[PDB]
């Protein structure tokens, strides 16, 4: 079973405007096949598919908490996408938007009109082409070392794609998001090298980093591993999951330094909230009376 | 954010013997159209493309809350799958099997081949005709009026293809899973129909239900309606989404009886573990070595 | 624009009982590749797309109607699936079906859940395999030597189609739609034969019949053409397309006598309905009340 | 059965130069997921697999005639498109076009390149990001209720799509198709609406409009209300479907106005005839020999 | 460029009996995700894609020729699904099939009815469910340690694809052909393993086998490594590519001995010829006619 | 089996620049439709799947033959791919990238993105709208003459094709490649009328040309066929294949004269190595370590 908290794993910055092409780049690393809908559902499915759940618990520990700290990083990446998209950010009303004016040519001319049509200018369950996130972007073999195989494989090829997509997109949104992943990432990356090491005794993590490049190259990532989150793998749990460090040890491939289980979720920042969309209709054509709807429930509660 | 909790959401009960073609058939229910991956990622996109997500606040606590739910729902309709393909359920080690000696033999002639060579007997990310689940599943127009009766539809579509798989098989797993998630299915599109109410005037549980026929016509369905589950909202969170009775009150469309918001998850049951397959070599062909490793990791002295 | 008979272009047999494999071979004939969707969508969009459609009226007028017939092929075949996966053809009511009396288990075995699943025991838009058709099926290039030497080349990959299923099964029903449907084909290919004879001064028709079989050998076609329907070109339309003989003149392939347009649609057989069927909730669980209310509507008077 | 009539619906004005993403945009309306294919085949097949044709006789005849209405709604937005990718727009010849002068250099840049490619600078079977249509966009469940109330939802979530395109070009081609199909929608929404207050006594009209905007506020939508088109529902057979007024009574959702039957089609307006396009040897790459082939038919005709 | 040889790359055995079903797993190993057409297509795109052809040429060389090996194994698996499915294998001509016979009924109960329908009962370019191969089968990253990091988990991949299959059936031409792959796929991951060992210094080689199960313990694999051809890189190249054994040397993973090169191909066996199948039309529905053409063609005197 | 020769089938020149655009639109000639990776892989299983091998020979030789000479036309396409997405064709260094100065950002822009994000600055095994190639873009019947008529069509249409987009880009590379192509896709489309016509009487070779343009319109290719090559089925296999001039004998559509057979492959041009792109980490993010390991290779080999 699984829990929410309504905070992103990062804060996130406001961007100046709609970036529309920024946002269709970012729809890599959340639909496409190394998106993070793939990370996520990889590991989902092999924490579900996982034989041996107590005898091989320090490696079932590891899966099914990493599937769960991938669910808050769609999360991070769609609100990046939607910051992107967004009109008018944390405004709850604009008036006098007529149709008639053609509010939205401009998404005549974007690469991604998907966004603008289907959704209400939002993230969509898809990657950069428009492509559609599919199931068979998932692995789950029931073979141990073969998945944990893929999932350093996995984890590489993703961060290859953030790393091209921040070379798109000089937004700060897309940056920071991008900056905090590459530092998750890397921990998931060293975490499955730890597995692979264990079980089968190659020194996986000597691989790293892939591509050969520093995470210290990217600003916005080397703030994130100056306050040490390339150490930290996060108990994304109440109670379970308690053997993470029998995995979760040693030097970290960034800088040597002891990694660290830390109990619990990270603080994070705010959701975020694009505002109101009239063109989008969005949450509708003209959202007072809703507004009202919503503040009548309050009082009739009572 | 997301945390996990290392349980199902019900009890299942202990599988007697494989079944491919009904693990087949419930894949729909799993990665079809209509399954729980659909209703899932329905409302977890919504969720994060909410707009207003403080001034129309009982709704995103809806839409937020039920996402989460879901996730639970993926993994009970993946270890109902899991328990219906695995050869030794709970059995950590099957020794002597020899794949010359055709030990996958059945799985020539089952429906789903796949199962047993891309899984290794275990859940994939699919429908009932092997067709991969793909995000164009997912509608997410910003509209929070279109939106909902989307939902409302999606639910009841849903319980219709749950009930004809019911009507495929009698495996006392899958009909437990399945009378369970017609309880669970049914809140949800009561939920959804009280938010239509309450947003459009129009009387949307009256329509229930669809198809017409009632869930304690479906003894498993009963069961849970006997202890009260068709009252139950549970919210899955910590501290958020606590407005939820907002609009999670009044009428169950089943009884007519008081429905009631639930603070925390239910108590839930176990995971389920599948067990050795050699013939899967999952988790390994013999992994009595790896149980080795795994066990040595907690030599680990403090 | 387009009118509508509640006819099919035959009389169909009533089937004598269910045979959800032979349905399942069948909509390779309406949702496949080479199927009925495919003629029908590939002249349909061709005679939207054609350009000089008075300057080459003889040849827009040719691909519009048989487009426009082909609309009754997908009506004729989905009526041929319809009746295979019919319980009770016909029989407004059956009671008494209870659901945890498992009476779908047939299902679970049989190539094609989808019907049972997403249909309510009916067809569906998609082929043996399961897979929808798609609009890459269509070629439809503006060029009008190029689209009609695609379309003689899919006339006779869909009659070979035809003949393979029709060697699967010896269901009266599917035999009888595709020996009528030979004959049409047979028709249409030699119709875009004649077409690429006149704009080219190949002798397409020489190349007929593909494979080298003749219809004559399939019992279902000779009953057709013993009726003289190989000779015929319908004109469906009240008062369009009056050109069709330029092109639809000289001699049948089939025997060498002289073809012939018919102005308007033959007459036509009663169109199916499977019926109720409780275990599919089709078209309701137990569709009294609906009856009731249907009947109650023609109480308006006058 | 079905005919045909050379007459779209409505009768298009005139672009004054090719509008390549404008074209590409259009697409969603054609063969996105909520476009007129889309409305088209659920019906189509819906009216197909319908159970109960006699006994639920008012509802078999709308959907069965809604769904021949549609077949000039693909025809009318495929001329939309068409009209927006066409050169020469009625000119039957233009000479001088050399392929060595890179006479299709724009279109390398735009959105859609597979209207130039694939497509002879002419509609094809797709959205607005290339994704061709594809048969699971169809929901024929053979229940009555469940499939009107997917019928209700799927035209609302296409007005919406039609709003949006709307938004996006500012075209008179594209904007008087809209107006008229956000009419003609708004009717089909209202039928299917009044069809569900009459099986379940829940008032769905009263939903309307989704999103909450009037059509009113669309000038050529007003323009179609203005001339009545909201109350009518035409019925395009000769002589089937005669109980379309049970139904489709009372009220109109638009002004309150009482709705009405209109026996047979409008009388519409001209095809469009995209005319010579050398670069995209469409007819053909000079077509005056198969102009004057076309002209010979004629003469020997006698 | 490429030249071809009129063998295939192993003499494979008569088969002595059709099996659909045995044929239909085997399609996995052809155009599933872990199938030929992956391990082909991935080495082909990026040989072509491969920046520093000269620089890092020993890499090049491998990666190249490895592709050119994939060509024969595609071949080899097709014949072998040609095999399963032949009718009269090496039979040039069979009589009195009679089409109304139902000839083809036991195809309308398979898995795989395409073979039969789509195919004249023969191999198909898809997989196990009747998934066509796609192209985002392939990665291509332009990165050379990441490409070679998923070629060593594609083949490991492929390689517990290849065992489940065989243990799905003892089909001898099947065994036959799966036997001698996993010994050349065990080549291919050794080298890929010394490649990465070679740019990394990660013994990754040490990983192997995956699964942990030796091909030793496959009889038909243990009768080719007896021959010594788990030694042997082939270099499939009149003259280029001659740099292999700078990485493909050292120890076999199978049994610790030097691995060699091997200039140019083994020697291979015959092609296979399925014979005259009738009721499919292949090559003709009677070819007798065919024959006498071709033959004739050979009366050209000189 | 096949072999390899690291040679173009003709020299390509240096673009000026990168040409994202310009990629993409000939990626249609690569993995859509009616692409060289459909015209390969068409030919390739034909020649697998036919049967009569001997009894047939002649037809045999020359689809088998055809579908070897398709392998280097891939190999073409790409190699005109990768030349128009390389930054510095040649140069095996470049120094001083900075990934936080937006490098990429030309490539949020661009049509495909896919290009920059998932390739390498690298071809893709896609289309022009970034639709991955599939296998049901072969058709494989056994039918030899249905095979063939398929055949024949298929070379027309990715002739148009290759019209379309050799009209869309003026790169010299893309215009080379097609001219050259243009010229074997003649050829080849000769050779399938010439089967045609050997077995049917039919005289396919008087429809060419289609479209109605002469290959001597198109500059490059006119100057391939100054040089003969219209007249040239080249035998690319070592002793295999050698009754070729059974068929490939006679007039060429082109301009009459007498076609020949070419013992052996052309001897074609230099394969292209786009060079270094730092920014997609291509083939290493700073390269000096990877070829100095080539280096060290080469002198312990000794
Ligand atoms: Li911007
Ligand atoms: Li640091
Ligand atoms: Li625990
Ligand atoms: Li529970
Ligand atoms: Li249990
Ligand atoms: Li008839
Ligand atoms: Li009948
Ligand atoms: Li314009
Ligand atoms: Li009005
Ligand atoms: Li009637
Ligand atoms: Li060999
Ligand atoms: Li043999
Ligand atoms: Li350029
Ligand atoms: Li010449
Ligand atoms: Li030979
Ligand atoms: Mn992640
Ligand atoms: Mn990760
Ligand atoms: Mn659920
Ligand atoms: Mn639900
Ligand atoms: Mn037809
Ligand atoms: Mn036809
Ligand atoms: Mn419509
Ligand atoms: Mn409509
Ligand atoms: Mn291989
Ligand atoms: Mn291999
Ligand atoms: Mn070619
Ligand atoms: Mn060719
Ligand atoms: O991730
Ligand atoms: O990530
Ligand atoms: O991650
Ligand atoms: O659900
Ligand atoms: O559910
Ligand atoms: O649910
Ligand atoms: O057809
Ligand atoms: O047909
Ligand atoms: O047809
Ligand atoms: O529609
Ligand atoms: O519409
Ligand atoms: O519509
Ligand atoms: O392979
Ligand atoms: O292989
Ligand atoms: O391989
Ligand atoms: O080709
Ligand atoms: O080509
Ligand atoms: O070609």
Redesign the interface.
Same mark, same amino acid.
């Given at each position: 079973?699984?829990?929410?908290?309504?905070?992103?794993?990062i804060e996130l910055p406001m961007p100046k405007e709609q970036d529309p092409?920024?946002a269709?780049?970012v729809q890599?690393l959340l639909?496409?096949?190394?998106g993070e809908?793939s990370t996520l559902?990889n590991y989902?499915?092999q924490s579900?598919?996982?034989?041996?759940?107590?005898?091989?618990?320090?490696?079932y520990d590891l899966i099914?908490?990493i599937?769960?700290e991938e669910?808050?990083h769609?999360?991070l990446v769609?609100?990046t996408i939607?910051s992107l998209l967004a009109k008018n950010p944390g405004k709850?009303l604009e008036e006098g938007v007529?149709?008639?004016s053609?509010?939205?040519?401009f998404?005549?001319?974007v690469?991604?009109?998907?966004h603008?049509?289907?959704?209400?200018?939002?993230?969509?369950?898809? =990657?950069?082409?428009?492509?559609?996130?599919?199931? @068979?972007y998932?692995?789950?073999?029931?073979?141990? &070392?073969?998945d944990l +195989?893929?999932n350093?494989?996995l984890e590489?090829?993703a961060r290859?794609?953030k790393?091209?997509?921040?070379?798109?997109?000089?937004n700060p949104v897309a940056r920071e998001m991008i900056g905090y992943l590459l530092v998750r990432g890397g921990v998931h990356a060293a975490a499955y090298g730890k597995a692979?090491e264990?079980?089968?005794?190659?020194?996986?993590t000597?691989?790293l980093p892939?591509?050969?490049?520093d995470n210290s190259?990217?600003?916005e990532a080397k703030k994130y591993m100056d306050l040490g989150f390339h150490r930290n793998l996060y108990r994304?749990?109440?109670?379970?999951?308690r053997?993470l460090g029998?995995?979760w040890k040693g030097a970290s491939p960034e800088d040597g330094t002891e990694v660290v289980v830390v109990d619990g979720?990270?603080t994070?920042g705010p959701?975020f909230?694009? =505002?109101?969309?009239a063109?989008?209709?969005?949450? @509708?054509?003209?959202?007072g009376?809703?507004?009202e &709807?919503?503040k009548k +429930?309050?009082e009739k509660?009572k």
């Open positions: 079973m699984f829990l929410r908290i309504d905070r992103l794993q092409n920024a269709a780049a890599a639909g496409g096949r190394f809908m559902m989902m499915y579900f598919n996982f034989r041996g759940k107590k005898a091989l618990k320090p490696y099914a908490n599937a769960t669910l808050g769609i999360e769609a609100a939607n709850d007529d149709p008639a053609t509010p939205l040519g998404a005549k001319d690469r991604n009109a998907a603008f049509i289907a959704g209400g200018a939002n993230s969509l369950v898809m =990657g950069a082409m428009g492509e559609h996130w599919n199931g @068979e998932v692995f789950t073999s029931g073979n141990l &070392i073969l +195989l893929h350093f494989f590489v090829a290859t794609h790393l091209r997509v921040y070379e798109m997109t000089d692979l264990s079980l089968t005794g190659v020194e996986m000597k691989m892939i591509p050969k490049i190259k990217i600003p994304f749990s109440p109670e379970d999951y053997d029998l995995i979720p990270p994070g959701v909230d694009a =505002g109101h969309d063109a989008e209709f969005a949450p @509708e054509f003209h959202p009376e809703l507004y &709807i919503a +429930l309050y509660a």
